[PDB]
Design a protein around this ligand. Sequence first.
Ligand SMILES: [Mg+2]
Ligand SMILES: [Zn+2]
Ligand SMILES: [Zn+2]
Ligand SMILES: [Zn+2]
Lengths: 130, 65, 160, 114, 266, 559, 240, 47, 84, 43, 138, 156
Amino acid sequence: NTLFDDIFQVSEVDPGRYNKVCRIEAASTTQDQCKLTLDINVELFPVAAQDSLTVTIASSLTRSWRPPQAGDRSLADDYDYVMYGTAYKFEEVSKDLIAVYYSFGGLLMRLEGNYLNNLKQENAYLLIRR
Amino acid sequence: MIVPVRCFSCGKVVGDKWESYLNLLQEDELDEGTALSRLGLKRYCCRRMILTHVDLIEKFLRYNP
Amino acid sequence: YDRKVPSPTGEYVKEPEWVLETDGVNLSEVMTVPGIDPTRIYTNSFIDIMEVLGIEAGRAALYKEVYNVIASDGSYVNYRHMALLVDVMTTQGGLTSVTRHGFNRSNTGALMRCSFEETVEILFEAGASAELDDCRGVSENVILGQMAPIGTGAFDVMID
Amino acid sequence: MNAPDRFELFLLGEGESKLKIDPDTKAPNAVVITFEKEDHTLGNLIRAELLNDRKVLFAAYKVEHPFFARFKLRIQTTEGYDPKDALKNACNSIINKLGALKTNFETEWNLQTL
Amino acid sequence: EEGPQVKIREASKDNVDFILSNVDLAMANSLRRVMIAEIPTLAIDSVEVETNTTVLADEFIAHRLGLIPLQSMDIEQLEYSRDCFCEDHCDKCSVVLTLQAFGESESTTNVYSKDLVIVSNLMGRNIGHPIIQDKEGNGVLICKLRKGQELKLTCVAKKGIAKEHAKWGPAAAIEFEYDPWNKLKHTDYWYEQDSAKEWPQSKNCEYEDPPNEGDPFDYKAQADTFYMNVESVGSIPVDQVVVRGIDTLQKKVASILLALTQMDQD
Amino acid sequence: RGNLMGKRVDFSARTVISGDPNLELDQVGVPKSIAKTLTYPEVVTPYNIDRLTQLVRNGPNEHPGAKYVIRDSGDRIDLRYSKRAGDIQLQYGWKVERHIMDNDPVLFNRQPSLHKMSMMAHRVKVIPYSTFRLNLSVTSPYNADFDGDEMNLHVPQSEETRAELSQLCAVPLQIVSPQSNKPCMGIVQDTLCGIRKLTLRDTFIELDQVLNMLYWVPDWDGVIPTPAIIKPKPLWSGKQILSVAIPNGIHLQRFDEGTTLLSPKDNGMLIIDGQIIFGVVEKKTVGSSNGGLIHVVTREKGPQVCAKLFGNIQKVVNFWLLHNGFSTGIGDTIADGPTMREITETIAEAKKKVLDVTKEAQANLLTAKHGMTLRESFEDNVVRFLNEARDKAGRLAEVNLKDLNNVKQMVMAGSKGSFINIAQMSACVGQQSVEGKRIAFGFVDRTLPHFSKDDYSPESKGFVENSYLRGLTPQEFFFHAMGGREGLIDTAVKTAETGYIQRRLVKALEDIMVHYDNTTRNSLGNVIQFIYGEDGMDAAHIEKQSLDTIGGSDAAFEK
Amino acid sequence: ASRHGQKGTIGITYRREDMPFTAEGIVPDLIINPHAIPSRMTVAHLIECLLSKVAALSGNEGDASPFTDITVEGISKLLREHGYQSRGFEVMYNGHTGKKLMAQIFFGPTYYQRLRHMVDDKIHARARGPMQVLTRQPVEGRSRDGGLRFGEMERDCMIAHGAASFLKERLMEASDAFRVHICGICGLMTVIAKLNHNQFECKGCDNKIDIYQIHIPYAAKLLFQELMAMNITPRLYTDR
Amino acid sequence: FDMGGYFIINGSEKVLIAQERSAGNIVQVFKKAAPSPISHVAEIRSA
Amino acid sequence: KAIPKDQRATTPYMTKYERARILGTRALQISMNAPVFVDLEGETDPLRIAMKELAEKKIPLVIRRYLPDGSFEDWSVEELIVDL
Amino acid sequence: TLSHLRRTNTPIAKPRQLHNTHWGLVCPAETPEGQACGLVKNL
Amino acid sequence: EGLVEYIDAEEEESILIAMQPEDLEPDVDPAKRIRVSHHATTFTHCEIHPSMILGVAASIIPFPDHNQSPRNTYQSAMGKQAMGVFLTNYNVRMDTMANILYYPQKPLGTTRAMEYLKFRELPAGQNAIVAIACYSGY
Amino acid sequence: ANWPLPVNIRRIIQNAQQTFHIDHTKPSDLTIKDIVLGVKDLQENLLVLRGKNEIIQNAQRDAVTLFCCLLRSRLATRRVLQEYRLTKQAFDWVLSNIEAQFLRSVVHPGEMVGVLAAQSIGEPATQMTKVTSGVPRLKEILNVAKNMKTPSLTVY
DNA sequence: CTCTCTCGATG
RNA sequence: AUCGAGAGA
Ligand SMILES: [Mg+2]
Ligand SMILES: [Zn+2]
Ligand SMILES: [Zn+2]
Ligand SMILES: [Zn+2]
């Protein structure tokens, strides 16, 4: 099912000596104590400054990866840019501030929040739209 | 020795173009580049193959045995 | 020189001190000079260290110097090796050299010492003094073409 | 001196069969087929044509050593679909495309000058 | 037709400049590989030297004879010596041509490829004749004789594959280029300042549309358009080079298919 | 020393070596002719009588076969001249000298044999052509290139000795060396640079190539890893597909400079359970470092798994690199115009400084440093200035280089080359020196007949403003030739004196070993160390660990 | 080797198909590795390549003379005039797959030379061959079908490993393995062993029943005999 | 193209390598070592 | 003289040299068609058979460990621990 | 051949080092690698 | 005509040599090499040409001033091991062992000193279309 | 702090909190006695020498003093319960694993470490390129030079 | 005190 | 085989 859902506002785009991946810095538009850092494949899903991207953390939509056949199959997304990685660190800034670290094939992610059902599990789909 | 029959790199025949090359150098009084161009040697590998070659057999024939 | 010194609060802090480097060596009189700390004074000559501060201090200085030689290139060798070298150079009583004047003058086997530098003369004086070769040395069993007491041959195998 | 005969690149040796089909033990419904006396020319094409079949899960070829002219081809298809049929369909597709290509090139050649 | 498409841009006796449309990369590449190597051709495989008083060595000359381009038109109705049921070679598998040269004049007596004389029985098949694209009609310069130097030898030419030896190579250099604008981004261009100004612009750029900077990267695009130029040596006409290339590839696929058909035997 | 301490032996071969990416670490490429030549006596047993009979049936000239057949009486049957070479009833107990076959234990060696890693046991793989083919990652312990290097191969003749080779002298058993308590083997050359290029965050791999690389791993589970990118296109990262080569249970943690779990520069390294989390893979990781990947895998999974790991990494990385490509041209030695201008002006201000110091010293205002001559002080200052100049210009040239610069890429990967190479090639090769000093006055009061007497200027004493890209002037060329000459001289001297020193060391510590009481002694029983290494540990099983009680405040200690 | 001290042997040979190729269809005669460039700093190799490329195209003779004002920039401009990358780079395609290569390859003519050292003149292998006469050890040389010297350092390595039986095998069965008889009294090779009659004599101590038999290298026997000829008695006892 | 400058002994081409030596009849002064009793030596090799 | 089975101070674990020597000796015995004390189960290589025979402690050999003074401790293969 | 015909041999403070006076008389580069280095020179 | 002189080292001690004849004359190219201007005036001699400091073997090296000197030395050594035509009369000589290149080629990059060494007449190597690339890893 | 010692305890611990999949939010089923007396009894098994007299036992405790310091430093109650959060099974597994690896790390009798040392010193001396350092200094040391080239006196 | 091919003269 | 010479890394 779903584990997290929020809308973030891109505050910075940084091509740190790259040309296909940029480190994006954004913050939540609902919680004033929630922020996000995320490496994005700009070559696929271009992310300019000051954008309102819809971000979702799913646990599903192990077995081998079959090609998207046909489908004629439940994609359970219809987003714009979807990734899959693994959480590796649960940093605790405060009692009211808990941060999680995801790794999407090298494309890292730092999500700082408060209230989470994000366990150290291989299941970590990152779905971004609009 | 003698002019190599074909180009090592690609394989284009060049052994039939040696005397023509020499003539283009002495008869029509052209430079090596144009002479190599007129013989259809566009790729610089064959161009090399003819330009770089030293005909030593002419010196070899100077002996009587 | 910069130096790591334990702070009163606990951690180690870089406390820089003035150190006197020197072209020239005479440890037997410099350390007795009023003004310096005579417990930390050191010289790159392990000879004087061996003659003044004892054979163990000479050992420590020897290892320090060898290790300095190795690490100066930027390389690294484990402690036990250089320690073994220095120990074998220092267990005779003084400083035994790694030449034909040092360890080759030891009271080991005749063939062993004969298989290095001075060959014929060693055999000569071994024949004159009627020496006994234990044949438990490596090179000796190498000469004899027998399974030397080395690793695999460092024991016997029987049946039970 | 120790250099092998050239014809050993395309001539099958004594007892050597063309194709060696072996049941893959790793993944279920998979197969590894050893092609003898063939290089990248065939392997790359077949592998590229096996990725067009949407009922094929896996398809990859490799030449284990450049000294020997041979390559292994691993194929994994969906259940209820024998991989040999996938290889056959791929091959037939290739042959058809090449036939059409030949015909088109001929017709296009007849319309030329000099 | 219905599949891949061809568009002959330029055509001549020696070269064919064309465009392959609606094709996979692997098929184009494999076609190139087959055209380069796996195509049957007739060339001198055996050389029997009787007398040789020339400067050049025996196997030197023999090697030069091996590289001589021969007529391989009806090569498909010639046979491999390894397949023919004869001894060594015959008229159904090999073509024998002699070579007798001798210094006559005081000047240097040149020995060309035209001096090769077919001895074996061609029995109708267009084969064995040494290609002479020379203007004077001489052909490949084989050797040079002095005054009393003699070169007497015989040449047995057999059907062979370029994969076995480059002398059986029917083609020279095959030009090959896809996506002149790097819209597929298969190449990360090296530069010092400006990437476009430093790297020369290909001719084939005149046959495709330049990218728009306002447009993002097309990640779902493959390679369809291929620009090729096949050059022949003379042994086999260009059209027949690419055509027999296709036929050879197709045939060696059909051999695999046949193998699959045969593996059903208990 | 020539007939007893060492002598010529039978069953030995010697050939020019070459690298082979498709051979395992503990494998050796053996030419077919050598395989037919070298032989092994195998006694006839019920387990192998069929195979041996077949080998005898093949005889010599055809591999695999046999050379001789020894009977009970002790008679030797030559299988190339005997009339009964066709019909032989191999009786039990008979010996059959068969050709060297695959997976046979042989001793690979390269002279000079400086340490035990110069002689290692390999598995035979009979291959065509006349070259000893060895794995790339075995180059380092042997200390060998392929620019004409030759190696020797010795063949055991009994079961116990080949057992000695397979159980003691085996290559996987020599990975972690007791010399520097670290692995002496690692990923080098193409595989290194390649693995640096693959694990870049910009490096993404699509379906087909991923399937190919996946198949290339022999230890593959056949399970397709879920791509790091799902939509709008299924893409895998280099790290992701490389993770397949790394065995499970392998945890690797290392922080570099600004490595902060998120690592904006993608530096450092974190690998959780055979899966790399973040960090560019290069020499600090997949190299022959102390706490590297190889050491961890060797100490954890075992030597065999580590060698197979060498295999996997090499195959994958070489495959990707083969279809990606890498090169180097003169363009990688060309810095920008303004950069060259800053370099030239740096050399200029340096020479100006030297000129000022010279004019000062000539005005007798130069106060000498305590303990040295005014002249020595002047020389020291000038030399330091010119060195600072070379370093400055070189650093400018290095900064100017892009990340797409091939030379800089090889420097980054740790594959080949260093900073000074870039410095001398692109910026300024610097000051030439002989016997510690700059080019002295061979002629009276001058270095060359092209200068005036008493010319202490930098260009006169052997400073080269130009780079290898720019071209050296005649004077600079000759001085550089002097320096290089001294280089070659002291090189030969060095290898000679070391050649003797090593022998002395060996002959000194020869009969020393650890007995069955952990007491390091000799042939006399004289105790050298009562406990070997003063702790009784083998240097092979020792890793650098931190003692986190000796550091920190007392407050933190208590806390 | 090139003309800049860039030595190297052939690793493998590839046909024109497997070889990488430019868009013009030009295939390299030779492929070298870039790692043999930055450490050795042979820039003149690269400059030679560029100059030779330009000279090839233009059909002129490239002047690579030492102290001249011919710079890499001029050569670059000349190369750009002929329609190529000024730094000699060329877009190449992988021969196996036909797909483009990401990085472009430094590609061009370079004057290489074939050295005298060839494998078929170096390759050597011996399994029991001709021995010498004095020491009865394998002869020296490849032409005389000789063996290879298991030198002192190799011995040291085998000691370091611990392989004792191997060291014994190299120093006996693989070389000179000789059987000698020793008198149980003095301990010298004075023994006259009349075999097939079991008559083990010893003139000097009258020994016929107390005799011994040991296995030593023939070189050791030679050493002992030479020491005996130099008035020394290497008495060999078989007991502690 | 043969430049000569060599001998032919028993059908074998021989080359005399130029031998480097110190010049005679030249006066040279050299400073002696520290353990040496003499400090400076002026010598000459007469021919 | 000797050393009693009790109060033995040497390492209870089998050294790598002891393992190599025992595997080599046993394989040397099997190579001359000697009786196998374990199930072959397909194995034909005498070294491999010796290894499997070691794994089941079916090797009737005994190690005589020599101390520098001249003393010696006996350790049966069945008793020694193999952790390598 | 040309190189061998113009060679210099030297028997037996620093005769190996490329001296300043070697300018224009002896090739600075052409010299064997090893024990004969510096001693064997070419004109 | 007193235009050229023979100078040994001993007499070379007392003269001032100009490196190039352009050092007798009373906005630049950044590409070219940095050359220190002549700070000397009283010249007595001038160099014929600096490239004459090299020997026969080193004169074959293309751009030796763009190399690290030991590499020039190495090439100076290996140049004597290259195959090619050593003499035109190689077929009428009976040497112990000789090697002759099949198709010799005069280098594309030459030297002005090569002219007098007859290298372009009797070359020792071929111009190979080289490619610097990490391919199969072989 | 960083020093070469046998048995990498860190990798053992991070293997423990991976094999048993222990979460960082669960009370450890350990006991103070379990940890303290467990670690204290673990040191008794770390045997290098196995004599039965006072001398050999003293040498034994002297030979493992450092590694035991490391052991106590890493396996302190606070560190085990708070930082590692090990369970009972995991802790016991850690102890057993440490003991095993330690017994593996012991040098094998018969090890020709003399030659090994001589080579471990001689070989890196081959790849070697203001006092006298490097190969000549090494030669001075090995020859035991009566008169070294750079006699220095470092005075603090 | 310092692993290979090789040549070429000597007994 | 014994002594000199060239060269390989
Ligand atoms: Mg080398
Ligand atoms: Zn060509
Ligand atoms: Zn026929
Ligand atoms: Zn007697």
